[PDB]
């Protein structure tokens, strides 16, 4: 049974190439390469990871597949391509036979997410992806969930992965007694689509990490894990670390531990096996 970290990044850091790494994020402002990741995975008995594009450009795809090309502990890559580009197929051919299993665009940084996903060219690209058994990772903020609802429903030919459980606004759970409710309604609406699955990752960094993770953040996170379980069911949940991004808020070990303690509480042995690699294996077509 594969044990998979379904969501991590790599980079040789250069400030202008990673606009999302800004002020107060100095911990991220350095290289993060497979060698730093292996001991972390080893400590959690995770045998392989999935490398996910951390910036927009084909060279990011090339870079990740280069790291992946001949490294057993990287099982798959989620790349980046211009999905609106008419030459999509030709471009993806360069990656034939490799561990490329899917694509992601950083939708959360789009100004009109809805206009972006409902675009005729982008839709063509995604439909082509699905026709070729490519996964598409959905990365949006909680408030953008309704903007991608219709998009997810129309692209039902292959698996869509909701990154970071759709980023609940955990920092607001105590100020805004509608934050949890709003996210849950949106989550449930997506989960009702059979071809959509859910990553349990990226939650420590939706809390107020700048001021520091508190015990109450861990409880809200558990609330989100429970909501995700209820909406998606135990067979559509996928552990990911979101390393190295998670280092803003918590260690790799802490990230894995809180999901583990939660899973031992709520899931059977078999369901845990799905959470810790089985679901990622089947959705990303892993050996
Ligand atoms: Zn190779």
Q: What is the per-residue DSSP string for the chain?
A: ---EEEEE--B---GGG-TT--TT-GGGSS-B-HHHHHHHHHHTT--EEEEE--SSSHHHHHHHHHHHHT-TTEEEEEE---TT-TTHHHHHHTTTTSSEEEEEE-GGG-SSHHHHHT-HHHHHHHHHHHHTT-EEEE---GGGHHHHHHHHHH--SS-EEEGGGG---GGGTTT-TTHHHHHHHHHHHHHTSTTEEEEE-S-GGGS-TTT---HHHHHHHHHHHHHHHHHH-GGGEEE---BTGGGGT--HHHHHHHHHHHHHHH--HHHHHIIIIIHHHHHTT--
- 1-287 has which CATH code? 3.20.20.140
Q: How far is the CA of 70 from the centre of ligand 1 (A)?
A: 4
Q: How far is the CA of 66 from the centre of ligand 1 (A)?
A: 8
Q: How far is the CA of 98 from the centre of ligand 1 (A)?
A: 8
Q: How far is the CA of 17 from the centre of ligand 1 (A)?
A: 26
Q: How far is the CA of 99 from the centre of ligand 1 (A)?
A: 9
Q: Quick one: 282 exposed, middle or buried, by C-beta within 10 A (0-12, 13-18, 19+)?
A: middle
Residues, Cβ < 5 Å to ion ligand 1: 69-70
Q: How far is the CA of 62 from the centre of ligand 1 (A)?
A: 12
How many angstroms is the resolution? 2.2
Tell me the technique behind this structure: X-ray
Cα separation, 152 vs 195, in Å, equals 9
Cα separation, 146 vs 91, in Å, equals 31
Q: How far is the CA of 269 from the centre of ligand 1 (A)?
A: 35
Q: How far is the CA of 69 from the centre of ligand 1 (A)?
A: 4
Q: How far is the CA of 124 from the centre of ligand 1 (A)?
A: 30
Q: How far is the CA of 36 from the centre of ligand 1 (A)?
A: 21
Q: How far is the CA of 127 from the centre of ligand 1 (A)?
A: 28
Q: How far is the CA of 41 from the centre of ligand 1 (A)?
A: 22
Q: How far is the CA of 141 from the centre of ligand 1 (A)?
A: 35
Neighbours of 283 (CB within 10 A): 20
| CB of 4 closer than 8 Å to CB of 48 | yes
Nearest to 237 by CA among 267, 274, 184: 274
Token pair in block for residue 25:
């994020």
Cα separation, 276 vs 178, in Å, equals 31
| CB of 197 closer than 8 Å to CB of 161 | yes
Neighbours of 39 (CB within 10 A): 9
Q: How far is the CA of 144 from the centre of ligand 1 (A)?
A: 38
Q: How far is the CA of 65 from the centre of ligand 1 (A)?
A: 8
Q: How far is the CA of 96 from the centre of ligand 1 (A)?
A: 11
């Amino acid at each position: 049974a594969l044990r998979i970290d379904s969501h991590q990044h790599f980079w040789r850091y250069r400030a202008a190439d990673y606009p999302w790494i800004g002020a107060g994020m100095g911990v991220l402002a350095r290289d993060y390469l497979p060698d730093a990741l292996h001991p972390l995975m080893h400590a959690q008995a995770l045998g392989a990871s999935i490398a996910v594009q951390a910036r927009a450009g084909r060279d990011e795809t090339a870079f990740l597949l280069e790291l992946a090309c001949d490294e057993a502990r990287i099982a798959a890559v989620v790349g980046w391509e211009d999905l609106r580009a008419p030459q999509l197929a030709e471009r993806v051919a360069e990656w034939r036979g490799t561990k490329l299993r899917g694509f992601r665009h950083q939708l959360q940084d789009e100004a009109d997410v809805r206009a972006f996903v409902d675009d005729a060219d982008f839709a063509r690209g995604v439909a082509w992806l699905q026709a070729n058994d490519y996964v598409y990772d959905v990365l949006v903020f909680e408030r953008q969930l309704p903007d991608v609802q219709a998009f997810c429903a129309r692209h039902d030919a292959h698996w869509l992965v909701l990154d970071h459980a759709g980023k609940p606004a955990l920092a607001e759970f105590d100020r805004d007694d509608t934050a949890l409710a709003r996210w849950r309604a949106a989550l449930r609406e997506l989960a009702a689509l059979p071809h959509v699955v859910c990553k349990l990752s990226g939650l420590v960094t939706e809390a107020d990490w700048r001021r520091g993770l508190r015990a109450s953040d861990l409880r809200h996170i558990e609330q989100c894990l429970d909501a995700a379980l209820d909406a998606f069911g135990p067979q559509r949940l996928m552990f990911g670390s979101d390393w190295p991004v998670c280092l803003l808020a918590a260690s790799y070990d802490e990230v894995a531990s809180l999901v583990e303690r939660w899973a031992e509480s709520r899931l059977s042995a078999a369901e845990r096996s799905a959470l810790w690699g089985g679901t990622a294996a089947r959705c990303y077509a892993l050996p």
